[PDB]
Design a protein around this motif. Structure first.
Motif, PDB file in Angstrom:
ATOM      1  N   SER A   1       4.154  -2.733 -20.018  1.00 17.25           N
ATOM      2  CA  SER A   1       3.827  -4.098 -20.413  1.00 17.25           C
ATOM      3  C   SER A   1       2.424  -4.173 -21.009  1.00 17.25           C
ATOM      4  CB  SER A   1       3.941  -5.043 -19.215  1.00 17.25           C
ATOM      5  OG  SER A   1       3.007  -4.703 -18.204  1.00 17.25           O
ATOM      6  N   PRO A   2       2.225  -5.082 -21.968  1.00 14.36           N
ATOM      7  CA  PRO A   2       0.876  -5.271 -22.527  1.00 14.36           C
ATOM      8  C   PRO A   2      -0.138  -5.738 -21.501  1.00 14.36           C
ATOM      9  CG  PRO A   2       2.550  -6.259 -23.944  1.00 14.36           C
ATOM     10  CD  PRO A   2       3.233  -5.905 -22.658  1.00 14.36           C
ATOM     11  N   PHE A   3       0.309  -6.371 -20.414  1.00 19.69           N
ATOM     12  CA  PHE A   3      -0.619  -6.826 -19.387  1.00 19.69           C
ATOM     13  C   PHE A   3      -1.131  -5.665 -18.545  1.00 19.69           C
ATOM     14  CE2 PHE A   3      -1.702  -9.214 -15.441  1.00 19.69           C
ATOM     15  CZ  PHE A   3      -2.633 -10.064 -16.003  1.00 19.69           C
ATOM     16  N   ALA A   4      -0.301  -4.639 -18.334  1.00 21.44           N
ATOM     17  CA  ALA A   4      -0.717  -3.495 -17.529  1.00 21.44           C
ATOM     18  C   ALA A   4      -1.763  -2.648 -18.242  1.00 21.44           C
ATOM     19  CB  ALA A   4       0.495  -2.639 -17.165  1.00 21.44           C
ATOM     20  N   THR A   5      -1.787  -2.675 -19.575  1.00 23.03           N
ATOM     21  CA  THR A   5      -2.760  -1.873 -20.309  1.00 23.03           C
ATOM     22  C   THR A   5      -4.093  -2.599 -20.448  1.00 23.03           C
ATOM     23  OG1 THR A   5      -2.087  -2.678 -22.492  1.00 23.03           O
ATOM     24  CG2 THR A   5      -0.844  -0.846 -21.543  1.00 23.03           C
ATOM     25  N   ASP A   6      -4.058  -3.921 -20.636  1.00 18.18           N
ATOM     26  CA  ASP A   6      -5.296  -4.689 -20.715  1.00 18.18           C
ATOM     27  C   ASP A   6      -6.064  -4.655 -19.401  1.00 18.18           C
ATOM     28  OD1 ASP A   6      -4.186  -5.182 -23.148  1.00 18.18           O
ATOM     29  OD2 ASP A   6      -4.258  -7.372 -23.016  1.00 18.18           O
ATOM     30  N   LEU A   7      -5.363  -4.505 -18.275  1.00 10.35           N
ATOM     31  CA  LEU A   7      -6.047  -4.390 -16.991  1.00 10.35           C
ATOM     32  C   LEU A   7      -6.736  -3.038 -16.853  1.00 10.35           C
ATOM     33  CD1 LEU A   7      -3.269  -5.984 -14.757  1.00 10.35           C
ATOM     34  CD2 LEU A   7      -5.467  -7.036 -15.330  1.00 10.35           C
ATOM     35  N   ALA A   8      -6.116  -1.977 -17.377  1.00  8.31           N
ATOM     36  CA  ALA A   8      -6.722  -0.652 -17.293  1.00  8.31           C
ATOM     37  C   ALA A   8      -7.995  -0.562 -18.124  1.00  8.31           C
ATOM     38  CB  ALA A   8      -5.721   0.414 -17.737  1.00  8.31           C
ATOM     39  N   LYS A   9      -8.045  -1.262 -19.259  1.00 11.26           N
ATOM     40  CA  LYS A   9      -9.265  -1.284 -20.058  1.00 11.26           C
ATOM     41  C   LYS A   9     -10.347  -2.125 -19.392  1.00 11.26           C
ATOM     42  CE  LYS A   9     -11.178  -1.304 -23.410  1.00 11.26           C
ATOM     43  NZ  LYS A   9     -12.542  -0.810 -23.748  1.00 11.26           N
ATOM     44  N   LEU A  10      -9.954  -3.215 -18.727  1.00  4.96           N
ATOM     45  CA  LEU A  10     -10.934  -4.058 -18.051  1.00  4.96           C
ATOM     46  C   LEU A  10     -11.541  -3.355 -16.844  1.00  4.96           C
ATOM     47  CD1 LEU A  10     -12.230  -6.886 -18.167  1.00  4.96           C
ATOM     48  CD2 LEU A  10     -10.459  -7.651 -16.567  1.00  4.96           C
ATOM     49  N   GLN A  11     -10.756  -2.531 -16.144  1.00  6.24           N
ATOM     50  CA  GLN A  11     -11.302  -1.778 -15.020  1.00  6.24           C
ATOM     51  C   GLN A  11     -12.317  -0.740 -15.480  1.00  6.24           C
ATOM     52  OE1 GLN A  11      -8.735  -1.115 -11.385  1.00  6.24           O
ATOM     53  NE2 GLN A  11      -7.121  -1.066 -12.945  1.00  6.24           N
ATOM     54  N   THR A  12     -12.153  -0.209 -16.693  1.00  7.82           N
ATOM     55  CA  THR A  12     -13.122   0.744 -17.219  1.00  7.82           C
ATOM     56  C   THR A  12     -14.390   0.052 -17.704  1.00  7.82           C
ATOM     57  OG1 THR A  12     -11.166   1.946 -17.986  1.00  7.82           O
ATOM     58  CG2 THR A  12     -13.314   2.816 -18.619  1.00  7.82           C
ATOM     59  N   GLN A  13     -14.286  -1.207 -18.137  1.00  6.75           N
ATOM     60  CA  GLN A  13     -15.469  -1.942 -18.577  1.00  6.75           C
ATOM     61  C   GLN A  13     -16.338  -2.345 -17.393  1.00  6.75           C
ATOM     62  OE1 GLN A  13     -13.846  -5.054 -21.091  1.00  6.75           O
ATOM     63  NE2 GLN A  13     -15.011  -4.329 -22.868  1.00  6.75           N
ATOM     64  N   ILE A  14     -15.738  -2.976 -16.382  1.00 13.58           N
ATOM     65  CA  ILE A  14     -16.524  -3.446 -15.247  1.00 13.58           C
ATOM     66  C   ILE A  14     -17.012  -2.278 -14.400  1.00 13.58           C
ATOM     67  CG2 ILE A  14     -15.305  -5.634 -15.282  1.00 13.58           C
ATOM     68  CD1 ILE A  14     -13.666  -4.721 -12.926  1.00 13.58           C
ATOM     69  N   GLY A  15     -16.307  -1.149 -14.430  1.00 14.10           N
ATOM     70  CA  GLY A  15     -16.730   0.040 -13.721  1.00 14.10           C
ATOM     71  C   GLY A  15     -16.080   0.269 -12.374  1.00 14.10           C
ATOM     72  N   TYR A  16     -15.162  -0.597 -11.952  1.00 16.68           N
ATOM     73  CA  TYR A  16     -14.477  -0.451 -10.675  1.00 16.68           C
ATOM     74  C   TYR A  16     -12.985  -0.263 -10.905  1.00 16.68           C
ATOM     75  CZ  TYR A  16     -12.422  -1.571  -6.125  1.00 16.68           C
ATOM     76  OH  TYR A  16     -11.686  -1.543  -4.961  1.00 16.68           O
ATOM     77  N   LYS A  17     -12.398   0.667 -10.157  1.00 15.70           N
ATOM     78  CA  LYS A  17     -10.975   0.968 -10.225  1.00 15.70           C
ATOM     79  C   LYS A  17     -10.308   0.455  -8.955  1.00 15.70           C
ATOM     80  CE  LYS A  17      -8.228   5.106 -10.394  1.00 15.70           C
ATOM     81  NZ  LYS A  17      -6.843   4.564 -10.467  1.00 15.70           N
TER      82      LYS A  17
END
Lengths: 139, 143
Positions: free
Chosen positions: A1-17
């Motif tokens: 899903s497009p929502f699952a990929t946008d979350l993975a990029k946001l976790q890399t920006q904020i720095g927390y997984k």
């Protein structure tokens, strides 16, 4: 899903997984999209940001006035002049799930999703200082 | 001096050993006593407690309504019904340094001193998590 990929990029920006990404999925879900949303998480994120601001300026100037600390807290806690800007930097307007009647570029929607991020980190990490760390280097 | 002794007993009662004890001395000094008072640390301690209460409820029930979470935060941060009975249980009424002419009520003096304890704990420890852990014990031993 497009929502699952946008979350993975946001976790890399904020720095927390995240260990449980549903806390982040719920953090990006606005109230207009579902009854399962981020109104309760954003209230948590508000007090986390208030605590992070108080922690820095008091550990920097212990003799600070109470009237000066309150204005610094209120300025960083401003929806349009600071809170929505940090949400726009992360591009939350393209991640927040809003109803088709709602426009995602609203500063109030941006600020709510931004505060809900830190309320989700503290629950997912079992610690508040981790959410305080992620607020800095992002603000 | 009786003040430093009441501070040593205070650290034992809360379970935290201050490195810089002048942070605790600053928390037990009301605004009417000196300009090196606890009004700033009181604002810090308020938001620490708001975060401590929010984390404990949101961890149990993630589906809690924002209206319920707000009422539960107001119940714990009540000046006369919570943030005072916790302070009076610790005996801060005899530890807080107050002037004879003070405009604040005894409930506000005890609450300001109680809140300012956790603000100084985080500054002394360098971590807010430590202040949240200590508050859960002090409040948990009464409510």
């Amino acid at each position: 899903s497009p929502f699952a990929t946008d979350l993975a990029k946001l976790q890399t920006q904020i720095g927390y997984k995240f260990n449980n990404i549903n806390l982040l999925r719920r953090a990006m879900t606005h109230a207009s999209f579902s009854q399962e949303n981020n109104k309760a998480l954003s209230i948590f994120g508000t007090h986390i940001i208030e605590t992070a601001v108080s922690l820095q300026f008091l550990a920097k100037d212990i003799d600070i006035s109470s009237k000066a600390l309150g204005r610094l807290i209120s300025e960083v806690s401003n929806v349009e002049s600071s809170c929505a800007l940090d949400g726009d930097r992360l591009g939350l307007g393209k991640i927040i799930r809003v109803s088709t009647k709602t426009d995602a570029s609203n500063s109030a929607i941006l600020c709510t999703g931004f505060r809900a991020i830190f309320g989700a980190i503290a629950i997912d990490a079992g610690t508040v200082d981790e959410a305080i760390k992620v607020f800095w280097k992002v603000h």
